[PDB]
Amino acid sequence: STVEQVLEYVKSNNVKFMRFQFVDILGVPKNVAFPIKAGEKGIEELRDVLENGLYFDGSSIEGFVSDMMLKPDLSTFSVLPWRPSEKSVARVICDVYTTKGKPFEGDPRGCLKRVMEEFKKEFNGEYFVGPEPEFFLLKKDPHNPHKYIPADDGGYFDLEPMDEAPDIRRDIVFALENLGFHVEASHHEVAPGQHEVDFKFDDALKTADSVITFKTTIKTIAEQHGLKATFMPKPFFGMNGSGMHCHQSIWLNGEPSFYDENAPYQLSETCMNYVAGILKHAKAIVAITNPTVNSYKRLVPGYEAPVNIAWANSNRSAIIRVPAARGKGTRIEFRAPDPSCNPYLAFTVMLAAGLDGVKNKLDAPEPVERNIFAMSEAEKKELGIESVPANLKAALDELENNDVLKNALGKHIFESFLEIKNAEWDSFRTSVTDWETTAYLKI
Amino acid sequence: STVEQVLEYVKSNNVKFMRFQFVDILGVPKNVAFPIKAGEKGIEELRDVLENGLYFDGSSIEGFVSDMMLKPDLSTFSVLPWRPSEKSVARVICDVYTTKGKPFEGDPRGCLKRVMEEFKKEFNGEYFVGPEPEFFLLKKDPHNPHKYIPADDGGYFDLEPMDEAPDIRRDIVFALENLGFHVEASHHEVAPGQHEVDFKFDDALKTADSVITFKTTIKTIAEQHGLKATFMPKPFFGMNGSGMHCHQSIWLNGEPSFYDENAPYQLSETCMNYVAGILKHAKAIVAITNPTVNSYKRLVPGYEAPVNIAWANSNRSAIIRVPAARGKGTRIEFRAPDPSCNPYLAFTVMLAAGLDGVKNKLDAPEPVERNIFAMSEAEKKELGIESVPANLKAALDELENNDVLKNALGKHIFESFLEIKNAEWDSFRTSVTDWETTAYLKI
Amino acid sequence: STVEQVLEYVKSNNVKFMRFQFVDILGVPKNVAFPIKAGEKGIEELRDVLENGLYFDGSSIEGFVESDMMLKPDLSTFSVLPWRPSEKSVARVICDVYTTKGKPFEGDPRGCLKRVMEEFKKEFNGEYFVGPEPEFFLLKKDPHNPHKYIPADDGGYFDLEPMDEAPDIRRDIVFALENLGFHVEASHHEVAPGQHEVDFKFDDALKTADSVITFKTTIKTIAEQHGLKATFMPKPFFGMNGSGMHCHQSIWLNGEPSFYDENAPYQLSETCMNYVAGILKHAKAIVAITNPTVNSYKRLVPGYEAPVNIAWANSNRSAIIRVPAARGKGTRIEFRAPDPSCNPYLAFTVMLAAGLDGVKNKLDAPEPVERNIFAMSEAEKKELGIESVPANLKAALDELENNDVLKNALGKHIFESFLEIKNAEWDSFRTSVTDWETTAYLKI
């Protein structure tokens, strides 16, 4: 955890290779690997890089445009998650700094650190997130070796042999637990080949490091079994999509500020302010937490689709759900994000939107216990239940007009993300899709 | 042309089968075929149907929802266009009436007839259209027998052997000419396997009957050669799409009202009113003249894309172009429609928009001779050059808010088209497209 | 079995993963696995889950329609995974479903049996024992067509190897169940090709239901390890025997074999007769639960040994009830209608309630029918007042809808959900175009 422990770990295990890992604006993990020179000089050359960082050319890193630096966060040093037995190699997650020595403004990781460091300095506040990313395991179609189909025909909570991934789920969980990245339950999900890994309600930065570690590890584990793991939100029409429900709460002065014994639903005012802030900015949040064209194939009207901007105690058709846990466990659950989002940026925008509600003491609308999807469009207009954007472009324009989220992400991230994702949308809207060929070639 | 001529044609050629043809709301042609009974009784049973129509169940005709009637328009009686040699069979284009005996309000053909009959009664005005539909000839992919590719690698105006459809173009033109449906030039177009057939500047109803006849005939001709003809607007990304440039003008009291010797560009005030009316309603017109999701893959920013709402004398980047012909040939050319549109409805909405400009003497903006696609977005905002909708849904909402076009199409057509095409869009936006799988399965 | 014993087993075996297992309304097993945290903290985090339960989302569990629910484990079922006994790092426990309020969920099939078994114990001091005989087919891909499945061997009843190609599979499923307390008895190749049968111990009805649930999963995993597939489909192949689950059962009042009377005819007590009259009086409604599939009724068709005729006998195989010759502590009745596709928790529940409904009301039983019911004409059956079970799934559901006894026993939630789900199941079959129809009618 400190420099010495790291070095003594190197000297004890003959660590011959070190990996410095970071993430691009879109959440794709990146790393550079250098060797550990043997002998006195080598252990000191390693000390100089662990404390002062190393240089690298980030001109080809999406969202990073020049000479830059990576700065190890030594609290993340551990054995390679996908190669725990291999002790000769180690890795550490890094923040991105500039040549001068300041945190680079476009670093997704540094972005989450800043907002949590400002929330810690100014209000002695903590921010905890507990995500529930879903994914699909895939194999090739025996009839069409150029396509992929679900890995099994198992259902929700199913047992073997219908569930063909109990060992895979057992391995990804073991791999994360044995490294400190804590998780809770896991199970086969509704759709075929779909699964879920529930993460520990924990520090939002540690949890963002968790998610990034988990996405890479499940993929390598899957490949060992001749399969592929995808975090595509809606890989197949006609079956459930993959979401990442995010349970979150804030603490002020070591106190669960969301709990109030003598308040309605035992929820504090600060909680309602936080909920109101999430609902106020939802239409723009999803550009970050649902950042793909395919994301909005999951965000479509449905019996259980989190598209309606409202909160409820038990209703699942709402975009926010409040679990029954109270006291230290009081939390709110934002149900819209899918696992394709960059966790650092998603966690940033949910806190900023919630805090913006707290900073302005925003009033929260009545919880909608009725089913939003079944009620007609008039009842929705009456109740004032709006919906999230229908496509990625519609969400990008909501984000472009959100100053709360611009100040939260910063200019560089804000402007680069919009530019990269506007090009991503232009490519889609200009492409000739199969759906059209099926529909219109005969006319 | 009259009842007698038809009967004498039947008696001379031993016509044993008769086809009564009409069209649905989406322009798909439909027909029912009945036999001609031999002898005295049979020729009289035929007279009763030719003059009073025949019954039919239009509950399964898109946009027709009950017992209904078809009423032959005897000016369209001829030998089958796709079977000219076969004299035993004949056909006639029909209007749709109700059981009572009135023109059915949802008939696309009757819709165009009404607006032209009102323009003829109230202002002694004629309406002429000369379209230029493009299409693609297709063969199977030898490597993937489940896909289609262009029929040749010929270019614009190309000669054989690179042009592999000179005989096909020669046959479709002969077939239409030999039946009265007049056309002008034809040639291989820019894209591979693409072609164009230029229709005669003629009565807009006769021309709408022309187009419907042409689309069916080119398809059957293609099949004879082991190919397929498609009027899909953008069947292949990376090559030109298929449009239907519509040359149009109006005449008042037998006078070319678009020509004014002593006016700017020798264009009359009525012409500018008509142009202004087309530009004013363009955003809603394209929902009818570009009625598919794929239509807007052709309507995308480009060096020669007709997306910018403006007119010019020679500029091709504008949505309206004015040919150099003057006098009796003075006309304007709306460049946005693609051949997937229902000609009857398209011709209706262009006249209503143009006349609405005439009825209100609307001022026309300055012609934009500069290239609209090359100038930046500021110069466009300065010049006030707006763009047509980017997708089918955006266009449908413009049509939903256009009272000029609602009154032109009528309630039934207006409301059915929006309903059918809103469902068509919902299917697209909920489908998982190949583009997404290519882009997001690896994340 | 005790909270401590479980925790000691965890520490010594270094168990890193625990499985919470339950069942849905249709008898499909379900489970959730959570990692066992390291250190004394994880052991205490654990302990809290075993005594108090774990919250789970049951919105997507068939028959479990708020979404917040609890899994409260019955620690008497703790053990290694029966299908991975060598992997000590994993264990599982069967649970009951509770509500947020800490009360048994009224839609829990396991809890449904417990309720009726506890009521029978408190009010009459009665135990309920069931000994089932599930049958199953082992399948292998047809060499000529890959899509189709065919029997795994061409052996017959009681055959030996080589014709019997699964004495080692039958031996392993028995060894796996016996090694973990789920007691079983005989096993043998059945009549039809690739058909096999594992006889279970005559035991506590709830314990028996747990063994059945575990047996079904285990035999499927064993089969797959041999490149085969095991199925509990009642009639997978026309032209041969279907798979049934003969259920031997009996009740004991005040620790006495109440079914036994030395002085009464056939050495059968009045209580036995009242119980048989209760099973027979409600037979048509029971089979909706014990035979809950469309395919079940392709096994319940008139035949020499088809248990479709609502009657009982001491030896006849054509009756729906048979009384084995064993007397004394072994006096029991055998209900022949059920098949292994049923939910054993619900099956044993309705059988108990139907018999105790006869015991409560002192119903006079009919005379035993030793003559072959199928051999005799339709008038002879009408003369003897011998009625048949429903001929299809929908007819049985309608019988269940009109049976108050089985509504009280199953409870409202299960009762209505099962009827709503199975009516949809029948609606899907009746609207489909089967290959039988294509074969018969495409030429016309």
Tokens of B11: 């008696």
CB A240, CB A165: distance < 8 Å: no
Cβ-Cβ contacts under 8 Å for A423 (sequence gap 6 or more): none
Whose structure tokens read 């966060």?
Answer: A73
Cis link prior to B161 (omega < 30° from 0)? yes
Tokens of B412: 């039934």
Whose structure tokens read 């620790």?
Answer: C255
> From its phi and psi, is residue C328 left (phi > 0), alpha (psi between -120 and 50) or beta?
left
Q: Which of B196, B202, B209, B398 is catalytic?
A: B196
Distance from CA of B427 to the nearest CA of A (A): 9
Residues B119-157 as b/e (b if ≥16 CB within 10 A, e otherwise) read beeebebbbbbbbbbbbbbbbeeeeeeeebbbbbebeee
CB B155, CB B162: distance < 8 Å: yes
At B423 the three-state DSSP class reads helix
**Other Cβ atoms within 10 Å of A75 Cβ, number:** 14
Dihedral, B397, B403, B407, B412 alpha carbons, nearest 10 = 40
Cβ-Cβ contacts under 8 Å for B120 (sequence gap 6 or more): B126
- Asked if A157's CB is within 8 angstroms of C32's CB, the reply is yes
Active site residue A170: no
**A–C CB contacts, 8 A cutoff, strictly below:** 59
Choose among B274, B241, B371: nearest CA to B316: B371
Mutation for testing the C interface, residue in A143, A157, A202, A247 having most C CBs under 10 Å: A157
Q: CB distance from C147 to chain A under 8 Å? A: no
Choose among A139, A161, A158: nearest CA to A222: A139
Give the helix/strand (H/E) hosting B207: helix B204-224
**Other Cβ atoms within 10 Å of B315 Cβ, number:** 18
The whole-angstrom separation of Cα A439 and Cα B19 is: 28
**Cα angle A215, A244, A128; round to 5:** 90
Cis link prior to B291 (omega < 30° from 0)? no
Q: CB distance from B431 to chain A under 8 Å? A: yes
Choose among B206, B437, B241, B264: nearest CA to B336: B241
Q: Provide long-range contacts, Cβ within 8 A and 24+ apart, for B35-42.
A: B36/B10
Q: CB distance from A390 to chain B under 8 Å? A: yes
Choose among B225, B240, B236: nearest CA to B148: B236
Maximum CA extent, chain A: 76
The whole-angstrom separation of Cα C408 and Cα C418 is: 14
* Phi, psi for C329 (deg, rounded to 5): -65, -15
**Other Cβ atoms within 10 Å of C18 Cβ, number:** 22
Choose among B355, B345, B360: nearest CA to B420: B345
Instruction: Kindly tell me whether chain C and chain B come into contact, counting contact as 3+ Cβ pairs under 8 Å.
Output: no
Choose among C163, C111, C126: nearest CA to C345: C111
Distance from CA of C36 to the nearest CA of A (A): 9
Cβ-Cβ contacts under 8 Å for A385 (sequence gap 6 or more): A308, A309, A310, A368, A372
CA gyration radius, chain C: 23
CA A150 and chain centroid, separation: 23
Identify the experimental approach.
X-ray
Looking at residue C86, the DSSP 8-state letter turns out to be T
Distance from first CA to last CA of chain B, Å, rounded?
66
The whole-angstrom separation of Cα C421 and Cα B402 is: 48
The letter for the amino acid at A323 is P
**For chain B, what percentages of helix, strand and coil (3-state, to nearest 5) are there?**
40, 20, 40
CA C188 and chain centroid, separation: 19
CB A277, CB A350: distance < 8 Å: no
**Other Cβ atoms within 10 Å of C328 Cβ, number:** 10
**Cα angle C99, C104, C105; round to 5:** 60
**Other Cβ atoms within 10 Å of B236 Cβ, number:** 20
Looking at residue A387, the DSSP 8-state letter turns out to be B
Choose among A346, A327, A268: nearest CA to A112: A346
CA distances to A271, A281, A336, C68, C328 from A383, in Å: 21, 18, 21, 26, 71
The letter for the amino acid at C344 is P
The whole-angstrom separation of Cα B21 and Cα B28 is: 11
CA B431 and chain centroid, separation: 28
**Other Cβ atoms within 10 Å of C391 Cβ, number:** 13
The whole-angstrom separation of Cα C391 and Cα C306 is: 12
Active site residue A429: no
Choose among A400, A344, A287: nearest CA to A111: A344
CB B106, CB B410: distance < 8 Å: yes
Q: How many CA atoms lie within 13 A of C250 on its CB side?
A: 27
Instruction: Kindly tell me whether chain A and chain B come into contact, counting contact as 3+ Cβ pairs under 8 Å.
Output: yes
The whole-angstrom separation of Cα C156 and Cα B427 is: 54
CA distances to B119, B127, B281, B341 from B352, in Å: 10, 11, 9, 17
Mutation for testing the B interface, residue in A134, A293, A426, A432 having most B CBs under 10 Å: A432
DSSP codes of every residue in C281-348:
HTHHHHHHHHS-STGGGGTSSS-TT-TTEEEEESS-SSEEEE--S--GGG--EEE----TTS-HHHHH
Give the helix/strand (H/E) hosting A382: helix A377-383
* Phi, psi for A257 (deg, rounded to 5): -65, -10
Cβ-Cβ contacts under 8 Å for C369 (sequence gap 6 or more): C309, C311, C312, C313, C316, C319, C384, C386
Mutation for testing the A interface, residue in B149, B432, B434, B442 having most A CBs under 10 Å: B432
**Cα angle C173, C175, C178; round to 5:** 105
The whole-angstrom separation of Cα C153 and Cα C240 is: 14
Residues B264-278 as b/e (b if ≥16 CB within 10 A, e otherwise) read eeebbbbbbbbbbbb
Distance from CA of B324 to the nearest CA of A (A): 33
**Cα angle C140, C146, C147; round to 5:** 95
CA C127 and chain centroid, separation: 18
At how many Å resolution was this determined? 2.4
The whole-angstrom separation of Cα A342 and Cα A285 is: 12
Choose among C308, C94, C58: nearest CA to C210: C94
Q: CB distance from B433 to chain A under 8 Å? A: yes
Looking at residue B1, the DSSP 8-state letter turns out to be -
Whose structure tokens read 């480009």?
Answer: B302
The whole-angstrom separation of Cα A346 and Cα A337 is: 8
Distance from CA of B320 to the nearest CA of A (A): 23
**Other Cβ atoms within 10 Å of C204 Cβ, number:** 15
* Phi, psi for C217 (deg, rounded to 5): -65, -45
CA distances to A200, B292, B443, C314 from A183, in Å: 5, 48, 21, 59
Residues B325-344 as b/e (b if ≥16 CB within 10 A, e otherwise) read ebeeebbbbbbbbbbbbbbb
> From its phi and psi, is residue A219 left (phi > 0), alpha (psi between -120 and 50) or beta?
alpha
Q: CB distance from A159 to chain C under 8 Å? A: yes
Choose among B72, B112, B117: nearest CA to B93: B72
CA A399 and chain centroid, separation: 18
Dihedral, A137, A139, A143, A146 alpha carbons, nearest 10 = 100
Number of helices (H) and strands (E), helices first, in chain C? Answer: 13, 15
CB A271, CB A358: distance < 8 Å: no
- Asked if A340's CB is within 8 angstroms of B443's CB, the reply is yes
Cβ-Cβ contacts under 8 Å for C133 (sequence gap 6 or more): C197, C198, C199, C200, C244, C245, C246, C247, C248
Tokens of C244: 């049934």
Choose among B139, B62, B54, B51: nearest CA to B106: B62
Tokens of C215: 């047996």
The whole-angstrom separation of Cα C21 and Cα C30 is: 6
The letter for the amino acid at C16 is K
Active site residue A40: no
* Phi, psi for B77 (deg, rounded to 5): -65, 130
In this structure, chain A runs to a length of 443
Crossing angle for the helix pair C205-225 and C344-361, nearest 10 degrees?
150
The whole-angstrom separation of Cα C302 and Cα C361 is: 31
Cross-chain CB nearest to A434 (options B427, B430, B433):
B433
- Asked if B237's CB is within 8 angstroms of A429's CB, the reply is no
CB C84, CB C90: distance < 8 Å: yes
State the alpha helices, DSSP H only, in C161-237: 167-178, 205-225
Maximum CA extent, chain B: 76
The whole-angstrom separation of Cα A102 and Cα A106 is: 12
Tokens of C195: 């058909």
Tokens of B374: 């090359």
Dihedral, B20, B25, B28, B34 alpha carbons, nearest 10 = -20
Active site residue B382: no
**Cα angle B93, B96, B97; round to 5:** 135
In this structure, chain B runs to a length of 443
Q: CB distance from A369 to chain C under 8 Å? A: no
At B252 the three-state DSSP class reads strand
Q: How many CA atoms lie within 13 A of C63 on its CB side?
A: 30
Active site residue B122: no
CB C282, CB C291: distance < 8 Å: no
Beta bridge partners of A19: A33, A91
- Asked if C68's CB is within 8 angstroms of A324's CB, the reply is yes
Give the helix/strand (H/E) hosting B9: helix B3-13
